[PDB]
């Protein structure tokens, strides 16, 4: 995450990390919706342009982490995946439209002071929170700077990172890029000359874009860090999967006879 600050302990109890098996590297991030279901961005598992189509035997999940590298024994829970569910109309060839995927932990995990699920937004909640100018949270273990070792020091975080970013009006999102924006994706960020900065960056893919309903004081996941044009660039914005729109499909998967 670009232009952010270290996270606190227990700030994102749902912040899941997608770790590749061999090599032992970071892939993306994800979210926890129940003791057994985990949500990400499809392009983290299936992205043909990179000769990439990972199966369960190709990755591990890691939850309850803070430092992105040390095996935090006291709290970290590692999991194997039972099933991967990529959205049937994930448009990877043109603009990652419907860039989403569900994952089922091969064995339910234990919740704790460091492990808790985010709430998915309902229609009413989508109504009042999703408004240009309102802020949401992005957290991740991805790059802190753009071009791998770009300007100050190392570009990888030691601990989880966070930034709070503003939702942007659709016309501005559409105007900023030459890619076919769809209704299944919103963009966020600070306008140029608005002072503040901050953005997602290579490594954050799949990370939760969260909002806190004042209505019930709970945290909801509106989107999923998907794609963008460079990190923290002027006049460009970060694009997230509009989760609420695709909720109908998650319901289908989970409830169409899971177990």
């Amino acid at each position: 995450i670009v232009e952010g600050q270290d996270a606190e302990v227990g700030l994102s109890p749902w912040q899941v990390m997608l770790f590749r098996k061999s090599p032992q590297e970071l892939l993306c991030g994800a979210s926890l919706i129940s003791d057994r279901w985990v949500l990400t961005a499809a392009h983290c598992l299936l992205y043909p342009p990179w000769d990439k189509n990972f199966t369960v035997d190709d990755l591990l999940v890691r939850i309850g982490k803070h430092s992105r590298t040390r095996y935090e024994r006291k709290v970290e829970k590692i999991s194997m995946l039972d099933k991967i569910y990529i959205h049937p109309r994930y448009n990877w060839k043109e603009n990652l439209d419907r860039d989403i995927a569900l994952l089922k932990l091969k064995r339910p995990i234990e919740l704790s002071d460091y492990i808790h699920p985010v709430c998915l937004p309902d229609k009413q909640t989508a109504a009042k929170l999703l408004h240009a100018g309102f802020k949401g949270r992005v957290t991740g273990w991805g790059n802190r700077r753009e071009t791998w070792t770009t300007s100050v020091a190392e570009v990888q975080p030691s601990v989880l990172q966070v930034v709070n970013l503003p939702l942007v009006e659709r016309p501005v999102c559409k105007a900023s890029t030459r890619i076919r924006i769809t209704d299944n994706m919103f963009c966020a960020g600070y306008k140029p000359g608005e002072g503040k900065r901050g953005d997602a960056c290579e490594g954050d893919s799949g990370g939760p874009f969260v909002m806190k309903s004042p209505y019930n004081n709970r945290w909801y996941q509106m989107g999923i860090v998907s794609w963008g044009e460079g990190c923290d660039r002027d006049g460009k914005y970060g694009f997230y999967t509009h989760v609420f729109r695709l909720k109908k499909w998650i319901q289908k998967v989970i409830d169409r006879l899971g177990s």
């Binding site: 032992q24 591990l60 040390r70 024994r73 290579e202 963008g228």
Partner: protein
């Protein structure tokens, strides 16, 4: 330009650029090509120079010896050692049975 060869997914899939440099993923490796480095080509996946292979299991130090056998037939010193092996030494390994591996 016109915002297209640099739009990319924020996924990590490190590759080693021919210019001796590591690229976040094959997309950025291309964007660089479209901004001055036409000669740029990939060479192999994985960073050019290996990462600082540190002490991930650094927290299992001092753990009392209590061996357990992992699904990989490697007798581990203790659970903690084993758990940690799964994110490093033996990706994904898991407890087969307590006590030394039966051989």
């Amino acid at each position: 330009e016109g915002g297209e060869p640099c739009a990319c997914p924020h996924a990590l899939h490190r590759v080693c650029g021919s210019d001796g440099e590591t690229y976040s993923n094959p997309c950025t490796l291309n964007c660089a090509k479209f901004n001055g480095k036409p000669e740029l080509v990939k060479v192999h996946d994985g960073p050019c120079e290996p990462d600082e292979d540190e002490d991930v299991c650094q927290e299992c130090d001092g753990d009392e010896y209590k061996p357990v056998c992992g699904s990989d037939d490697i007798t581990y010193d203790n659970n903690c050692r084993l758990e940690c092996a799964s994110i490093s030494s033996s990706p994904g390994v898991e407890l087969k049975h307590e006590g030394p591996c039966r051989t």
